[PDB]
């Protein structure tokens, strides 16, 4: 029953009542406990079109996290065009928790189970669903953490490379295990990855690239300018804002006790607003070992509009794209 529309969606999670940290405290009143039996209805002999970038469902998630982030991590100072603000800024406990969005009455959501689906046009095998699988909301530039992984092969998703400026996005078949650390110079930080995982991924990436763009010599190079967040890999890990050098990881042509590549990060009291234009000031750090093991699930890049070569450079900026990588194969329809 192909009939797309606009609605006001609602959240779902496994929030905890005793708890004091942010995410779940937002969840306890903004939504509902998970139903331990999510069912699926396969639709035999039906194929249907979709355009995987023009979606209100993304915007609602986008607006939710804004209305989440603004009220909970309350900064010390805020500023943009003729306007300055300062409130109380306590350090808070924090983590990412998996979320499902769900469908109101006279209406349901579907699943494009084409694991070889790119974005454009028809989904072959399809089913219907009450609510999506769990996703913890990852606020990150360049890289995609803790999200949804590929099952068959590593596939690429962008509007069209003919319109280059359309940010290109990636999701992977296997996960890269990363650990970041700041010990108890209290500003300078660092991050760690063991070479062999990173080297082969980009090899298998380059191999799927020489196909998508017919003919080439795949070269990887870093960012070229503009503000901090996008030029770096910027992210949150419990009560701060990480900003890490990404210069080494984009390293030219990749060709067909375990050694670790180590990246010089730093933290910032000062952050450029990701919702709109604006620059932000937060509480200084707390003492001790600051660590998170989290896994990379994909990546954002942009086709470099320069040279008869194959220069691919890190993306980011927008967070609507950050939402795109996991909700990809979950849709909007009327029962009629």
């Amino acid at each position: 029953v192909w009939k797309e529309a606009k609605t006001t969606l609602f959240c779902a999670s496994d929030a905890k009542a005793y708890e004091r940290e942010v995410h779940n405290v937002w969840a306890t009143h903004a939504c509902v406990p998970t139903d331990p039996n999510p069912q699926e209805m396969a639709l035999g002999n039906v194929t249907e079109n979709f355009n995987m970038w023009k979606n209100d469902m993304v915007d609602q998630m986008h607006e939710d996290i804004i209305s989440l982030w603004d009220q909970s991590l309350k900064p010390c100072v805020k500023l943009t065009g003729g306007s300055t603000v300062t409130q109380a800024c306590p350090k808070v406990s924090f983590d990412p928790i998996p979320i499902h969005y769900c469908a109101p009455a006279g209406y349901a959501i579907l699943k494009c189970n084409n694991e070889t689906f790119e974005g454009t046009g028809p989904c072959n095998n399809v089913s219907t669903v009450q609510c999506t699988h769990g996703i913890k909301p990852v606020v990150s530039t360049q890289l995609l953490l803790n999200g949804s992984l590929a099952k068959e092969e590593i596939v690429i998703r962008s509007e069209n490379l003919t319109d280059n400026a359309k940010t290109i996005i990636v999701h992977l078949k296997e996960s890269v295990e990363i650990v970041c650390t700041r010990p108890g110079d209290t500003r300078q930080a660092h991050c760690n990855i063991s070479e062999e995982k990173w080297n082969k991924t980009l090899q298998k990436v380059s191999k799927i690239l020489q196909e998508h763009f017919p003919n080439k010599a795949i070269k990887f190079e870093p960012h070229s300018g503009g503000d901090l967040e996008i030029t770096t890999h910027s992210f949150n890990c419990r009560g701060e804002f990480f900003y890490c050098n990404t210069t080494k990881l984009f390293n030219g042509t990749y060709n067909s006790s375990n050694t670790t590549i180590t990246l010089p990060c730093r933290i910032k009291q000062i952050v450029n607003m990701w919702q709109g234009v604006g620059r932000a000031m937060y509480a200084p750090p707390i003492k001790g070992n600051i660590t998170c093991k989290s896994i990379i699930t994909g990546l954002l890049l942009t086709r470099d509009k320069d040279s008869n070569t194959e220069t691919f450079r890190p993306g980011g900026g927008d967070m609507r794209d950050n939402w795109r990588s996991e909700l990809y194969k979950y849709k909007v329809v009327e029962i009629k």
Epitope: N215, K216, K305, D306, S307
Partner: antibody, heavy 117, light 110 residues
Framework: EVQLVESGGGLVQPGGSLRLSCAAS????????MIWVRQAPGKGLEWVSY????????YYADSVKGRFTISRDNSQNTLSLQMNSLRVEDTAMYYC??????????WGQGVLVTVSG | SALTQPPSVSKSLGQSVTISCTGT?????????VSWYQQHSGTAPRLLIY???KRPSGVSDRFSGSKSGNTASLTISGLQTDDEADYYC??????????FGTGTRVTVLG
Amino acid sequence: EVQLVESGGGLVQPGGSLRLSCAASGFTFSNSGMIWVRQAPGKGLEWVSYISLSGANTYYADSVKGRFTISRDNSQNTLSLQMNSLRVEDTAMYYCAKEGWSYFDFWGQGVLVTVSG
Amino acid sequence: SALTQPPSVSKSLGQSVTISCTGTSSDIGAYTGVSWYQQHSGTAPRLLIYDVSKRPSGVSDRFSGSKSGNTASLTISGLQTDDEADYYCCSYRTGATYIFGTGTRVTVLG
């Protein structure tokens, strides 16, 4: 109507210097890569140099490497080729050409550079 | 180091002619950034085929391009008097470089 106007051809003594200019109109000069191409009298064509739209990425051939220099001005919409330490084997008809992508539509009329004493 | 063409081929008016273009596993075998070009004696070259088989606007359909393993090929059907010229193929090589073919002189008989 797209054009490529070449100038600066003529005789140079061997070891001497010359600079070639290619003037462009009818399209956006930036957003497009550019190439120099020479043709020795009665011989096959050979690629000289590549420059990218913003610059920064410049590529050269070996029988020319270290002697020729590619530059562009994205305001005046001009391509420049500075040539030093010229030998007689370089005597050729020289062409500037616009890049589509990995292919090359639209060509200059050709300026002949002769290297002789 | 160079792309091998037959130096000369010869057919009649209306007939079809095939030019072969041979390189290495580092240029033609890997890539489809392949482009064919026409050169009458003493004029500027004109773009014919690009990306193996594609035609730009301004080029007669009688021309067609192809690729297999390590060899590119050009096909000109319905031969005319205008078609009498030198022909060259072009390829991207590993290391952002480009390389040109030896040249095929097409002679239209009768």
